[PDB]
Amino acid sequence: KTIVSTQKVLIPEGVKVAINARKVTVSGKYGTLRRSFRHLPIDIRLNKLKKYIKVVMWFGVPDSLACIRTVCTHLKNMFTGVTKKFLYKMRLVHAHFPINSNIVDNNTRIEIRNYLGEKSVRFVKALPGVVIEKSPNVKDEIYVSGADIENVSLTAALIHQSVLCRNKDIRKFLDGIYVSEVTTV
Template structure:
């Protein structure tokens, strides 16, 4: 196998303050601060994260498949962090019910789903990290700087409304993700 140098570069906007401490990236922007540690004992000596001017470089001397994929993963996480610190992320969810009206409330970093398919007890879903959930009549908005926290909170809410032992074609009640956006309103892929 040839031993080529791998280098991934990510452009950093001017309104973003980026600090790199070893394998930890800290970004401060208009929407908030986000940090992530990429230290992995298996690869930490083979990959380095550097900042030069207005770009971040992920560099490795090895051309192994695992190292290449990890460099790409770190670059993708860094791009998501830039998007979160500059624009923020917003996921929209919609409440669907046929007979029993579902009521949703936020209490103590948990989303409570009541009267789901006529159940007496409340189903709960954890809010992850610094994500914030706002509840409308039949819709929810999850907002935050970390796409991972926002996405996992949306997944927790969707999973809390999972119906088992019934035909999903008939029982379609639940809370479903309808859109992924930057807080500026621009729709993101996914």
């Protein structure tokens, strides 16, 4: 058992932060993110004038300490997102059949065609706020980008899950779409 646990999180230059009773809100260059924390005990205190956020816990236990670190990192990701969007580079791999990637609906809905010659379409609609662009560079790269660290990852995960094969040795058959590079725009 322990009396006090704290953490102090710097705020980047461009952000408009505004917390209120564990409803944290961050706005910035690339849109506004709201992300509730009122499930958790926590004495979030704000500091607009000199920047920084202070997270402070009273009477923690190691569970609580873990939570404080979890909240702060997640908040920092949100700042990172609004300042400079997350770019997740996903390379589409094929041994044999050429996997056809058709982006429609204003960088929503990536339609994936011809996976292992199946002659059937796999559609994976994105999370809101999520661009699916294609690379101009290396032909099989596909860009999943956005403000929210969660939504881009979930979209990427959805794409990855949607593709991969069934009942063949996964040691041998490698075809499918994978996450290469975690970056920002």
